[PDB]
Amino acid sequence: DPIPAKIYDKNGELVKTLDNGQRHEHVNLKDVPKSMKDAVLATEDNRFYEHGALDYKRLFGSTLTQQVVKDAFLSIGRKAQEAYLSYRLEQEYSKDDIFQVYLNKIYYSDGVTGIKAAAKYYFNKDLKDLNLAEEAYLAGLPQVPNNYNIYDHPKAAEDRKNTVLYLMHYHKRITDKQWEDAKKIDLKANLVNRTPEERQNDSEYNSYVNFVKSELMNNKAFKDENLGNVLQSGIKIYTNMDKDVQKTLQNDVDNGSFYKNKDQQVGATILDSKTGGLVAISGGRDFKDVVNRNQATDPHPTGSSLKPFLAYGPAIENMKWATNHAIQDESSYQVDGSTFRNYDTKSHGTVSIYDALRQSFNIPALKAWQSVKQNAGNDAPKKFAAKLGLNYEGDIGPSEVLGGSASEFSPTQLASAFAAIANGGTYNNAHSIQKVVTRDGETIEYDHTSHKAMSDYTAYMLAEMLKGTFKPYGSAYGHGVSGVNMGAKTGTGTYGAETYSQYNLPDNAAKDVWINGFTPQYTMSVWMGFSKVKQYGENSFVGHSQQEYPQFLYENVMSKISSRDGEDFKRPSSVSGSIPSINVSGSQDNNTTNRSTH
């Protein structure tokens, strides 16, 4: 029975409580229009006054009672406890009592329970003065409230409304005429005008709540149910959220000055590097839960973010390369019937992969990816990446290596992948919920996916190389935090070659920009893009200067929240040497250089 859900941070403190979900107006059964009740019955349980608790004719050659119960407490036979409670309920209360409870407690979407409020909401009408088509729709809505809500699926909502009208005619609850009359009414006519904002009506938690709501139904114990039905059963949700970090991340996102215009978007995820627990998340600026796409959990092109996982990572793992392993760079380069060049269009000659990664050269990463493909097998890259949650439906071409094509993942996904590097090479699928405590007192334990993604040396060597990103000439030089030990990998994702012309985009125009940083404590992943590609690059990142934006967000937040205790990534006894010249013990590298970049 009705009671809002409560969300608790990492300290057990109450952080948020989901209200706004009470547009409910109580109605007495005498005060409900005959035609409204006729509508309900005709569609849900026509012979409700007859059949008693279960409908045995239906069953052989549902029921209002059953609905009321299913709604309240709720895999193979837990349908039988419904049956039994329905029986009991049918023994305690009369048909009028039950019919009334139905009309007062069933969910109508957008946080509406009860036909009385469901009418005042969708149509601003009293039950008395609302029309036939409006009744039919309000009668069919409750079945699957999310798919029938007009505001979201007007086509479905009209089909549902027509089905009810049919049923009503078929059960001869309305004449042949009034049927025909009603299917002429415009349903939308009196439809109260709202935008996604009013439909909902301490915001630093919005993105986190949005995230928890999604993960909550992924557990076996709730997977079947509904949103507006599992959140009203007074459960208590305990999360890994850091109250403080979450506020910081969302404030800095909302009040940051690193937005070129109003079409620019962000997505930020912050995990506990070690555990994988979601410490804070932001889906965008001034993010409204259902109103806005949660950009922290939606996929975007990754640009050069994935190099550690498709090229150098699998290369250090599978053929034990040293960090100063040497690759021959060029100006152009062939892979299939396609040419590839570096972003700066140059060739840097011979380069240590330490630099090749921290400055994100494209050819050397293609070479490396190709070397992993030969010396470890064509599926070696896929396997490595797949350990870190980065899956690929089909083939991994040179494009996905460079972040194009199928290389689309959420900031949350990348944060998880990178946190692996940040903690000895153990992968932890991002997880916000610790446990939920049900109204009575039961404790459901949630768990997440965890498992070795890479061997200790690989993780340490990546962690060490990527520290070089914040060092001079590094793709994120100047944006690292001072006393803090952190490595990072930036991503810059270009546009399709055709779209450069269609929109007259300048040469240095980028569509997605990422930074993925990690300390021993936190891993943080930031993506930024624009909602619509405009002409001349107005909605693109143009030049290092503009593509550098997410690094301001990263630096700001990582500086406020990171602790200066001087912790570092733990060095395995399996690595020998020091940056930029780290190798795998007892397996030094045939091919190396002491050659620097600039």
Domains and CATH numbers, the chain: 1-22+199-241+424-454 (3.90.1310.20), 23-198 (1.10.3810.10), 242-423+455-598 (3.40.710.10)
State whether the Cα torsion 231-234-235-237 is positive or negative: positive
Render the burial of 141-178: b for 16+ CB within 10 Å, e for the rest: bbbebeebbbeeeeeebbebbbbbbebbbeeebbeeee
Q: Three-state SS for 26?
A: coil
Q: Which two tokens stand for residue 350?
A: 């011979």
Phi, psi of 69 (to 5 degrees): -80, -55
* Angstrom distance (rounded) from CA 118 to CA 150: 12
Longest dimension (CA), the chain: 91
Encoded tokens for 209: 């709540």
- Residue 18: which of 32, 31, 28, 4 has the closest Cα? 4
Q: Between the CA of residue 544 and those of 7, 102, 402, 403, what are the distances in Å?
A: 41, 61, 18, 18
The three-class DSSP label of residue 528 is: strand
- What are 325's strand-pairing partners? 592
CA-based nearest residue to 584, from 322, 273, 270, 315 = 322
Q: Is 537 strand, coil or helix?
A: helix
Residue 470 tokens read as 């914040």
The experimental method is: X-ray
Ramachandran region of residue 135, left (φ > 0), alpha (ψ -120 to 50) or beta? Answer: alpha
Within 319-432, residue ranges assigned H as helices are 353-358, 362-375, 380-387, 398-401, 411-421
Nearest to 330 by CA among 312, 349, 344, 311: 349
579: left (phi over 0), alpha (psi -120 to 50) or beta: beta
- Yes or no: say if 54 and 66 are a contact pair by the CB < 8 Å rule: yes
Active site residues: 44, 304
Per-residue b or e along 285-313, where b marks 16 or more CB atoms closer than 10 Å to that residue's CB: bebbbeebebbbbbebbbbbbbbbbbbbb
Within 362-508, strands assigned E span 408-409, 426-428, 433-437, 443-445, 450-452, 487-494
Q: 522-530 and 450-452 as β-strands: parallel, antiparallel, unpaired?
A: unpaired
CA distance 174 to 378: 68
